[PDB]
Design a binder for this molecule. Structure first.
Ligand code: UB7
Ligand code: FES
Ligand code: FES
Ligand code: FES
Ligand code: FES
Ligand code: FE2
Ligand code: FE2
Ligand code: FE2
Ligand code: FE2
Lengths: 405, 404, 425, 407
């Protein structure tokens, strides 16, 4: 059981909310590189921890991420002119650089120019995404390759969808092996075991766990191990396939919205391209998603669930495996009332995720280094994996690296 | 630097909100005359200071302005039948006249005489239906507004129902700095984009100048553009060589506003309604919907053309008012002035800020609300623009409104 | 100078039109292998040479291509039930197989020989290079299915963009044998640089020249012709020529100059006199060639954004192919997006069948004039017993191929010994 | 086998076509009563045999049917003012009455004798079982209007579904007189049998032909057959084997060479026969869901008649909903005039062959001065009906004494 209290604590990220402050202790993806386009390109809107952000790429190709509302009278910078090494607001011609310095003010003589600085965040570009450090400046750590993007020879293919529900349930969905055998029946293996035994192993960055199913052959002394990795506060590394690995990173746009990024990543000639990935997942922009990466599926059209399809044997009658997830997640409401839950042994990873985060948030709201920073970070040596193993090797012992070649 | 409380005091108008009661002391435009139509024409729904209203023209051709909801069981009168000197509710057949007197009650037999429905005194003028919405015994006699001398003048109005609070919209009216950037590609013999700002308080608001350096002779000359603020939310805008310009805003509620943009002057030099609308791109059925709501909106980024912008045009948006609309709206439903960062160009905005708070505070504690009485403006108050010698004061400049 | 006759002859394929009969001597791409889907999958409608076709994959996973209309009372088969080794009509239960045998008639007392006497027009089908092919010539004129010049064998990635263009085939192909246009029409797409090839990243194809007026040369051959466009390069055009060799494989295949990583082809299949299946292909090594979806997004021939369910283009004359007039003021040359979409806007506005009578060609057009002579010759010879052009021992194969290079002026482009871009080659 | 010539003759009805002249000898449904509305009600466009038509009910409530273009300068009368006992053209105010008399010309000093001088093409009309009928053949060949075989008298409920179909009339009737199809196409809708292969018989009459479909009954198959009897009343009526509670009827009127108005009727005792709206919902031929304002269907070739491919994989045979639409799909996809020349028929089409032969003869006969099939002494009467029962093979089905389902 959790309390309406702890639900609030684990879930809210807007404003003062602890989990928010804690989260901003990490680098965050603000948006996709493909959105910001060429030098001097169209400014893009984005949103993290309930703060509206412009992202533009100035003429020097530097990417800037700032408070959307211009420092003068609070008009939007998204309508601005990106040229000549700066974003210039439409109303009264103030022009900020990616750093947030105001280079000019077409309407003003004195020296207000030097002495006004606009909320701008240090940015970093990696693995097809635009990252920003959204917590206190002199706490920003240097940028390390995240677990699912070792270095820049790796192919990283991103699906992005802006989902209208709180982040926590979207992740709870990722560390739940039981469900692929149920939701993803008709989509997703050497085993037909529907009830996996679950084992956890706490770590410095989050945790590891295993789904132990009875394999199709020699269920006698063999186990089929599928092992997911939760990297706090909002990453999951999903059990890989024959050829590439799969990761989920979720960025809370606010209390009830979350940017959801589902990644394929491996050796470039074993890994799908971006546009292939999305077609598979049915998150293709303009067929599946609007121009903002908002799903055309929703409660109204019952996520295009096809009832005939279902009677024909197709399990969910919803096409694209994440869309199937979406259907479930979003019907749990804005913020899922964990208060009303009725968990079983299958939700072991889930109960770890709540315990761990509730832990690392109160701790943090009290002066502990926030879970997963400093000496402790996960790196590209931690990774999910799936194999068949003897019942007599520990799965934690298994010496797996991320799939490649 | 303003407090949150002041912004709330300056800005709110629904219910008892002081700025509300203050405004209701002036005559207020409720809607356009075009909307009301012929005698016995279709009822119009309109909204002022967070109160819903019917407007209908009866058989005699009297226009009324009443509470939208029937005095029986609060059904919408907008659905009623406007005929034979009354508006009759569909439901039970009660029939009010423009004055709010209940003439009949189809479904009942001395009640018909002793029930009044809220109606306000009304006046047509300059193509608008005006009402008085303050206490009945405070109603002035209707004087011409400073932008409609008498109705041999041509008054061509664009209306747009903007979904944001009233004040930020006027704030944009009194801001001569903005057109030097925003209306970069629409707007004058100068390119001084940073003009010295001068102000002069009055009994009815303020006059103010914007002192640009002219294309030639900015040794002993200033190009001066002067703008007049009539409280509570009216602004006389520097005219051009042919006709003058005015903006009056009526708060619909705390987060919405009727925005009337007016060209005015002599009928042979002032453009016609539809020409105006087409110019400012505020045409019903292309730029706006049947209720004068803009089809442009944040969802569609006001139809900004990003290529147009790479091709020289500053804003990418078409129709100088919509480029205004973009800014006003993006600041949010009520602009949080708390978080502002004003400069020398915003001197005019500050004056309004400061004057109106004085006025509302003064009024709240029982002063006559600013603009009433002896203190009124009338047609001789006006904006102007000319090249003025540096050795003359502009407050001195003796200018009347463009005509012939 | 061409004549109303010669045009009609060159262009029409419906009916007993010879250019039709000639064409049917080749294997024809009927539709995309992706359209037919799974065994017992929904049946696809298609159209070649003025004939309606059902294509389906049976329960054994065989692909049949047949006449669309049911042998019985001519109802559409595309509505029928594909199951248990056949396609069955909804009306009277007749069930054909991939071959054209009516294996059942549910209405008809099977106590008579009605079922074995009825044969329904089908064609021998083949699957290859991501496409379903059929032989729509006379039955025992059918050659063993040879690897096409742009799909060597099956270790090769082949990414296809399909677009059903609503004009005649011949203008579309004329488009592919025309190096001059790319320097005018595809100004803002094939942007000149200090390179040697034309990489991209959905960035741009490059090209080491800015010469818009290339010297043209031709070489007739058994299967059609090759030609070269000779551009002065940016650097040392003294004794160097940037060669770009396009190959025409008759009747309607264009081998287009490769870039750095992969090769480019075009194959057009006339649906009828005034419409044309246009397939535009990237092909080469699996790890250097774009995946299907990636290709389409670059070309803006994505189904459900650029094209509709049936691979028909959403851009048309009405919407002026989405011509962004602003973009044109701001620099982008055509103001239309996805470079084959630029081609289309032209080909289309020349009308259902270009009236080649009123043309006014230059030395830019030398390659097109070459296609016009050849095809009119080969069709005339064919109408008089001559083995249809590019069949038998005379066919192209995977050793014919386009190429680009800077070559010294004192080598003959015909002499250059090139192979299709692979990984090293 | 049939010939391009004959097909033409069977099918075309516009202009001078012989099948046109023959058809114009019978009373014709022009459109539903439900359309012409109250007196002074909005004028209705309609189209029979390639002639455009205005229908309107005047102040007295008489229903006129006229040529659509105003007699003056040929503007549409469908835009006209229907009041004060006349339809008045909007242009120059010429006003006609149902009978095609011009009562005034609002811009002419009509005080003399070129206001009566002008009649306007207008046909005699009758209201009956939900339908405005007109006789559009030559004046003096009009037979006094006898009750058709599916509406015995106006104490019957007659529930109609109308559908404007974009193909020639003939393939739409062929569809009605073809029992072979109900046990294949309508397999998941449509009986004490599972037999799909039934021995047909045909008997010609003066009005058309009767025939019997014979299925072996699910039980006692040795000396009993389940008889389904359909009656073709020419030119394009079909009486279709009834059910337990009501009878069925198809009449098709050619709008022209490549379109038909398809009227499909439920009829019987008022308390055993569906209401209009029920029928339409059952057949999915409801105006405003399935059909547009003009009874034109929203399912078409472009949207594959809403064929649900999954539903089919699920085992519902056609994956099209409402059994008439299963039919439409087939008929249309054959194309505007089925080229009967590429037909390859079998035993199951025995009836359709009868239809072909009869009509081809009856029109060559008509063209050479014989009476038009099933007119005068020859006509069908409400004594003619479709029937189905289980009968011994030792009664002649032709002889069976069945009457129309009622109670
Ligand atoms: O038909 C086409 O789309 C096409 C033809 C030629 C070339 C070229 O030679 O670069 C490119 C594209
Ligand atoms: S508000 Fe952005 S410059 Fe004035
Ligand atoms: S509420 Fe309007 S009369 Fe009853
Ligand atoms: S037409 Fe296909 S079986 Fe009757
Ligand atoms: S055409 Fe009808 S009256 Fe002139
Ligand atoms: Fe999932
Ligand atoms: Fe403005
Ligand atoms: Fe091209
Ligand atoms: Fe049927």
């Amino acid at each position: 059981m959790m309390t309406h209290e702890e639900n609030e604590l684990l879930c809210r990220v807007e404003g003062d909310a602890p989990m928010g402050r804690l989260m901003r202790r990490h680098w965050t993806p603000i948006c996709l590189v493909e959105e910001v386009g060429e030098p001097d390109g169209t400014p893009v809107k984005a949103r993290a921890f309930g703060e509206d952000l412009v992202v533009f790429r100035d003429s020097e190709g530097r990417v800037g991420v700032m408070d959307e509302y211009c420092p003068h009278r609070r008009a939007s910078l998204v309508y601005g002119r990106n040229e000549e090494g700066g974003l210039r607001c439409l109303y009264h011609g103030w022009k900020m650089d990616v750093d947030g310095n105001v280079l000019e003010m077409a309407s003003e003589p004195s020296g207000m120019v030097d002495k006004v600085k606009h909320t701008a965040y240090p940015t970093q570009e990696w693995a097809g995404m635009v990252w920003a450090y959204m917590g206190p400046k002199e706490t920003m750590p240097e940028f390390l390759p995240p677990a699912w993007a070792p270095t820049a020879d790796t192919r990283v293919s991103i699906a992005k969808v802006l989902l209208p529900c709180n982040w926590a349930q979207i992740l709870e969905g990722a560390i739940d092996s039981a469900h692929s055998s149920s939701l993803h029946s008709s989509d997703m293996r050497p085993s037909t075991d529907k009830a996996p035994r679950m084992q956890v192993q706490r770590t410095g960055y989050g945790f590891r766990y295993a789904a132990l199913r009875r394999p199709l052959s020699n269920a006698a002394e063999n186990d089929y191990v599928r092992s997911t990795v939760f990297v706090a506060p909002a990453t999951a590394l999903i059990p890989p396939n024959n050829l590439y690995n799969v990761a989920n990173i979720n960025v809370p746009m606010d209390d009830t919205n979350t940017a959801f990024y589902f990644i394929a990543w491996g050796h470039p000639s074993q890994t799908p391209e971006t546009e292939t990935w999305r077609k598979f997942l049915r998150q293709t922009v303009g067929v599946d998603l609007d121009q903002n990466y908002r799903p055309l599926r929703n409660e109204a059209n019952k996520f295009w669930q096809d009832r005939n399809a279902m009677k024909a044997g197709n399990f969910t009658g919803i096409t694209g495996f994440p869309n199937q997830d979406v259907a479930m997640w979003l019907t749990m409401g804005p913020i899922a009332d964990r208060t009303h839950d009725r968990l079983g042994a299958s939700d072991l990873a889930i109960v770890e995720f709540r315990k761990q985060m509730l832990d690392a948030v109160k701790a943090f709201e009290q002066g502990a280094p926030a879970i997963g920073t400093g000496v402790e970070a996960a790196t590209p040596t931690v990774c999910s994996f799936q194999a068949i193993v003897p019942k007599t090797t520990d799965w934690r012992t298994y010496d797996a690296h991320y799939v490649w070649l």
